Design an enzyme around this catalytic site. Sequence first.
Site: not given
Ligand SMILES: [Cl-]
Length: 294
Positions: A37, A107-108, A131, A271
């Site tokens: 995301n 991330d995701w 991350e 990030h």
């Molecule tokens: Cl998120």
Amino acid sequence: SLGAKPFGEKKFIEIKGRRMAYIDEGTGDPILFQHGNPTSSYLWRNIMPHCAGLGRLIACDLIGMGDSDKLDPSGPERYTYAEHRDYLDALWEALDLGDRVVLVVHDWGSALGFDWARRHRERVQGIAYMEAVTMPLEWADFPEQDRDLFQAFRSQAGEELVLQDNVFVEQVLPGLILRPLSEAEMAAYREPFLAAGEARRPTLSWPRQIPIAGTPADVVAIARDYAGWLSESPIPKLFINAEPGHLTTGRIRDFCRTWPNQTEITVAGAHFIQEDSPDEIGAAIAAFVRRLRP
Ligand SMILES: [Cl-]
Ligand SMILES: [Ca+2]
Ligand SMILES: [Cl-]
């Protein structure tokens, strides 16, 4: 180098009655890059070139993101981790990846990739991550400066913040990149989310799915499962740490630093570190793959 040009040509395939978009360049065993995301395959555009000639370079757009179709009808119950996983599992099946896959995740993309790897361990040659959600979280483990905003996402205020005002794309994204983005770069990131309302649902459903303080229970259990597995798996790993970093710091970094057979390097970034240090990241992944594929 940096640059706003995407890597390769977007390809399209029908998955569960929806068209999903992906990049697929070159031949051999895949190096599979997975965004989270609120990004897309575009996140990897300056990284993938570093792996030229080292295998089949693949970056998929998650359902409802990048150039992949929106779910229809979209709503508060759509774009859960489970739903994303159903689409991504099916896309990865359709791509005929074989049994020596190198995963590169963020991330995701990391929650999805880590889980897929746990369920397909014999097919995973290596995992590069950065991350990432390395384990179920407590509020203390979540970056202090983002607690209020993400708590707001995970409340009734989330629809106005995200669906109406596009806060994840327009605030969180550049807010967690150290260098200024160009007009063209932000245009690419906002393109799937130009329309207010349900087009932006994936970017709100995602923060609502983060395993924090036991909720949501299903994602917590999935992350608990892959955390235990990764802490024991002898599959070779590359941990790209970041300075100052963001998510993968403190306890969750302390944890992933216990994972076996792991190389670590540190690059500049918060990030979305792909936008700050793409060449350092790409060079590290390329070296990782070369050692995996002598
Ligand atoms: Cl998120
Ligand atoms: Ca910034
Ligand atoms: Cl083979």
